[PDB]
Design an enzyme around this catalytic site. Sequence first.
Site, PDB file in Angstrom:
ATOM      1  N   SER A  69       0.839  -1.238   0.000  1.00 45.85           N
ATOM      2  CA  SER A  69       0.000   0.000   0.000  1.00 45.85           C
ATOM      3  C   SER A  69       0.863   1.273   0.000  1.00 45.85           C
ATOM      4  CB  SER A  69      -0.949   0.037   1.152  1.00 45.85           C
ATOM      5  OG  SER A  69      -1.967  -0.926   0.956  1.00 45.85           O
TER       6      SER A  69
ATOM      7  N   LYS B 233       0.602   3.558  -2.892  1.00 48.60           N
ATOM      8  CA  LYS B 233      -0.448   4.597  -3.086  1.00 48.60           C
ATOM      9  C   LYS B 233       0.216   5.982  -3.211  1.00 48.60           C
ATOM     10  CE  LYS B 233      -4.480   2.089  -1.416  1.00 48.60           C
ATOM     11  NZ  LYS B 233      -4.039   0.901  -0.671  1.00 48.60           N
TER      12      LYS B 233
ATOM     13  N   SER C  26      -6.846   3.260   2.885  1.00 50.49           N
ATOM     14  CA  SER C  26      -6.008   2.400   2.012  1.00 50.49           C
ATOM     15  C   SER C  26      -6.895   1.544   1.099  1.00 50.49           C
ATOM     16  CB  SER C  26      -5.103   1.562   2.869  1.00 50.49           C
ATOM     17  OG  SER C  26      -3.926   1.308   2.141  1.00 50.49           O
TER      18      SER C  26
ATOM     19  N   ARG D 229       3.844  -1.327  13.549  1.00 48.90           N
ATOM     20  CA  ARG D 229       4.505  -0.487  12.501  1.00 48.90           C
ATOM     21  C   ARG D 229       4.677   0.932  13.058  1.00 48.90           C
ATOM     22  NH1 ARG D 229       0.294  -1.692   7.707  1.00 48.90           N
ATOM     23  NH2 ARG D 229      -1.016  -1.104   9.488  1.00 48.90           N
TER      24      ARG D 229
HETATM   25  C1  LIG Z   1      -1.841  -2.214   1.499  1.00 54.54           C
HETATM   26  O1  LIG Z   1      -0.715  -2.604   1.879  1.00 54.54           O
HETATM   27  N1  LIG Z   1      -2.915  -2.972   1.666  1.00 54.54           N
HETATM   28  C2  LIG Z   1      -4.261  -2.465   1.543  1.00 54.54           C
HETATM   29  C3  LIG Z   1      -4.823  -2.440   2.973  1.00 54.54           C
HETATM   30  N2  LIG Z   1      -3.981  -1.464   3.687  1.00 54.54           N
HETATM   31  O2  LIG Z   1      -3.934  -1.376   5.113  1.00 54.54           O
HETATM   32  S1  LIG Z   1      -2.545  -0.703   5.566  1.00 54.54           S
HETATM   33  O3  LIG Z   1      -2.394   0.598   4.965  1.00 54.54           O
HETATM   34  O4  LIG Z   1      -2.883  -0.640   6.986  1.00 54.54           O
HETATM   35  O5  LIG Z   1      -1.391  -1.541   5.359  1.00 54.54           O
HETATM   36  C4  LIG Z   1      -4.866  -3.878   3.476  1.00 54.54           C
HETATM   37  C5  LIG Z   1      -3.489  -4.512   3.435  1.00 54.54           C
HETATM   38  C6  LIG Z   1      -2.820  -4.363   2.064  1.00 54.54           C
HETATM   39  C7  LIG Z   1      -3.406  -5.310   1.056  1.00 54.54           C
HETATM   40  N3  LIG Z   1      -3.746  -6.443   1.640  1.00 54.54           N
HETATM   41  O6  LIG Z   1      -3.553  -5.055  -0.139  1.00 54.54           O
HETATM   42 CL   LIG Z   2      -2.721  -0.095  -2.949  1.00 54.01          CL
END
Ligand SMILES: *C(=O)N1C[C@H](NOS(=O)(=O)O)CC[C@H]1C(N)=O
Ligand SMILES: [Cl-]
Lengths: 243, 242
Positions: free
Chosen positions: A48, A51, A96, A228
């Site tokens: 993510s 982004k 996200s 994190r």
């Molecule tokens: C990005 O890494 N993703 C989309 C979503 N994001 O949450 S995060 O920003 O807390 O990491 C879920 C996890 C991940 C995905 N599974 O695509």
């Molecule tokens: Cl993404």
Amino acid sequence: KEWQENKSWNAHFTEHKSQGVVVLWNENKQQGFTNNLKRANQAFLPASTFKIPNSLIALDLGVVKDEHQVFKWDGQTRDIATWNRDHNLITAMKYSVVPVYQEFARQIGEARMSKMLHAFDYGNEDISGNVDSFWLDGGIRISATEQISFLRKLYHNKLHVSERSQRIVKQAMLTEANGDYIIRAKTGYSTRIEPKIGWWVGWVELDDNVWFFAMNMDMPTSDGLGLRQAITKEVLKQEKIIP
Amino acid sequence: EWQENKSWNAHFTEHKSQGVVVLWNENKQQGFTNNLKRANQAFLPASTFKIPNSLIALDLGVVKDEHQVFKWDGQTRDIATWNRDHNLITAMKYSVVPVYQEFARQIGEARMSKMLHAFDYGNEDISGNVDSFWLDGGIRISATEQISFLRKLYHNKLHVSERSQRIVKQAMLTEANGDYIIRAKTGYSTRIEPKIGWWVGWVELDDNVWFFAMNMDMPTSDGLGLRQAITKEVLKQEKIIP
Ligand SMILES: *C(=O)N1C[C@H](NOS(=O)(=O)O)CC[C@H]1C(N)=O
Ligand SMILES: [Cl-]
Ligand SMILES: *C(=O)N1C[C@H](NOS(=O)(=O)O)CC[C@H]1C(N)=O
Ligand SMILES: [Cl-]
Ligand SMILES: [Cl-]
Ligand SMILES: [Cl-]
């Protein structure tokens, strides 16, 4: 000296039965610090955290008009409740929202995505795989040190997109602000190829300096995702960057 | 449409205080206040004037960007945070009057008057010192007029560059977390009676923005903390913030 290892930070991972790396960059001193110089330079899927460049490219090409343009929910129910609703860029970053960013990547297309990642010097610049998923299960890889180098360029409006595109994405990255600091950042969670890792990349703005950061950590399950931010903040508190 | 909610007087009473909170619901296009008369009472904007002053300074090139350094003139002043170098972000944060007085001098009376007319700002009257009219001159603005001006700034509708508006909204950033973002500016009118405190700005939520403007009687600097505290008590009562 430019890069310095501080093994004392490993206690922040040890104390949470975790393994990972925190990289800090002191912009005023042009010096970097890490608990693990090897892992600071190992490349992982961005997941993510992709982004950030995806937002920049979408705005610069006019795929996204501005931070208020509404991206209507496609009416497909997904796992994450906050995804099953209308979004703009601010809320799509905050929650996200993968399906919004998948549509951006499809509208950008392979040719423009590839040229813009080269222009950004972003990680290995390799978009092999599906244009709407390569940052999750494709060829692209980036290290914590390479995240820092990309974010410094964004902070200084030095990326090869409009100043406006960069200012909008920095607004969208806003995570925390108070009378002591501002954090602009993006989380990620790479689960489709081993090792599963969590990311947090961004910066802390103080009155007279900025500290860039990039962390990744082994993330065998979603239970540890709060670490994190928690581990990064334990390092920032040790170094007297935040209270 | 406008509605009076006298129940918010309780948040003023509890702190032994007089003033007004004005809220505007952007999605519903509806206003709320504890005192409709005071909502339309025009006062000196004092430090809230830093919002239009920054916009004009950026649009004219008096301020090149939010990193440009304004060196301390070396004159030791009462507020410790003023006795140091600043950029736009720290000058807003510490409300550094001397930096903004230098901007006003470089803008000048003619361009300042024209730009406040273009912004439809208050009574658009800059009578007084070009570098103090907003603290002890003829300019007057009400809480409802503050909201009008801020809605234009939020929507990039003021007749200055989009870039100037984005920079000033960045400099306004006061607070952010996973529930809300506040972009705002405090003020304290100290020189002309009645002495009042201001807090003006907005709260950004996931799917709405609430504009606010409050002022309150401020006979001494002891109650300055109430500008934010009383506004937050009204925002909590209205379930805008947790
Ligand atoms: C990005 O890494 N993703 C989309 C979503 N994001 O949450 S995060 O920003 O807390 O990491 C879920 C996890 C991940 C995905 N599974 O695509
Ligand atoms: Cl993404
Ligand atoms: C602005 O109203 N002023 C400058 C400074 N800031 O106080 S604030 O917290 O209300 O912004 C002191 C008060 C006032 C002034 N004295 O000019
Ligand atoms: Cl911002
Ligand atoms: Cl001022
Ligand atoms: Cl812009």
